[PDB]
Write a protein that binds this ligand. Structure first.
Ligand SMILES: [Cl-]
Ligand SMILES: [Mg+2]
Ligand SMILES: [Mg+2]
Lengths: 277, 280
């Protein structure tokens, strides 16, 4: 029960087969110029320096890969917004990986505001900042919280309801809509319907490939703790149920407008490609 | 299908079973905020000023029917800011009229500035922006999804997709984001701003709303009702569906009890108060 390694190959193949049948369109990686990647890394370093944390270029590049693979390159209009999502993703990933004893909101929150004010217009900057603030504040609030225990152990429905915020997808949507400048996508981002539609597909993939690491650290925010992964029959029924969840979401996503559904599906499928890369 | 046009045969039994569930699981009864006649006149005058640019005349009696949900579904023991409370009264009522209006008469250029005016009158500068954005997103969502293929997909596929739509569409996310200044409670404020507050309360609010508005909505051809996902003409299929919805409400309520005391008081007063107002 400590590991999903016996299922790693089969589940990877089954994820890919599902995407090939229901999405078809493959993710494509955004290539940053050397100048853009250096500007991103310099902003990341500047933002986490007040916390006294050193992070290598290699670690920044591993954090940023999800952004490079999970946006929708054919629809990008604003590369300043794109770089902002690169930076905000990376620096909040560092914050998400830190011991809460090193969490200094007075030092970090002004750095998030500075990033938002550099890359976004005034209105978008407020929206992106509030979402980043809500995300890091949620991360802090729910470490060792009875609420997290109740939501993550009760049922898949309560667990994914928690993960809408906790996996960062509502934040992601609210900092990503300026990349596309697409009115319908902007509204779905702001109502969080965008995040609610894509939460299960992101979370189930994240959870499968981070299960071994997370259970070894005593973390409970993983839907595969809701089943007995040591019982092959129980695991296979649970995994199929999660695949069915992803498929139901994907098929509803196809009712959205063409640009919006490309963004949603590139996000779910790109996250899978980056996670397995 | 006339047999599917009504939940009237189940009206008494379902009302009794809702109440029984609340008595077992919430216990604490809702209590009604009473406004002074000055407060209520101020609320209604703001409501009239807000909808007059759209050519709507609304009697005091109709306003009072709209506002009863705020009076019954807030948490009086925890109120700290009655200016924020009056703002929730006005915003609920004026967006209720907008929700009931001919979508032809929808004039965002005239209405959105009135919403901002209400928010700027009653809230501090930061809270006014949060309440206004939530009102804006709600009325815009209402407009976007009339005759939308997205609404049809989310509302006919499964209860999960339907309640996902209703987090915004029934207005609970808006409600949480305009109500947190009433309580000035840091944890509740955060749950409102992440929308976890809305996500926890959506089913309890929607199931009750849907049951008691089913007849009117299907008579109007409206599809945003979870009881269209079952055959209400089939007593066996209806009672199994209704029991599953009751189980949803109970699971939400039992999880809500893991939140801090003040927050859970607010969440449960909202669900239970909405039921009391709806059946009155
Ligand atoms: Cl805001
Ligand atoms: Mg994980
Ligand atoms: Mg209704």
């Amino acid at each position: 029960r400590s590991s999903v390694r016996p299922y790693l190959e089969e589940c990877t193949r089954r994820f890919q087969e599902m995407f090939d049948r229901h999405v078809v369109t493959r993710p494509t990686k955004v290539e940053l110029t050397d100048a853009e990647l250096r500007e991103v890394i310099d902003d990341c370093n500047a933002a986490v320096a007040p916390l006294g944390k050193t992070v290598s270029d290699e670690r920044w590049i591993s954090y940023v890969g999800v952004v490079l693979w999970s946006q929708s390159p054919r629809h990008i209009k604003d590369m300043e917004a794109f770089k902002a999502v690169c930076v905000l993703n990376c620096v909040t990933a560092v914050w998400d990986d830190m011991d809460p004893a090193l969490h200094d909101f007075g030092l970090f929150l002004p750095q998030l505001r500075k990033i938002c004010e550099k890359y976004y217009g005034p209105e978008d900057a407020e929206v992106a900042y509030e979402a980043a603030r809500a995300f890091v504040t949620s991360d802090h609030m729910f470490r060792d919280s009875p609420i997290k225990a109740a939501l993550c152990t009760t049922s898949p429905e309560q667990y994914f309801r928690f993960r809408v915020t906790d996996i960062g997808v509502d934040f992601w949507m609210k900092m990503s809509y300026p990349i596309y400048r697409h009115p319908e996508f902007t509204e779905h981002a702001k109502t969080s319907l965008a995040a609610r539609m894509t939460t299960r597909g992101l979370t189930i993939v994240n959870d499968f490939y981070s299960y071994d690491r997370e259970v070894s650290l005593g973390q409970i925010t993983n839907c595969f703790r809701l089943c007995d992964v040591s019982d092959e029959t129980a695991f296979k029924e649970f995994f199929q149920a999660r695949l069915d969840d992803m498929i139901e979401d994907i098929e509803c996503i196809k009712a959205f407008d063409q640009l919006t559904q490309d963004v949603f599906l590139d996000l779910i499928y790109g996250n899978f490609v980056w996670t397995t890369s």
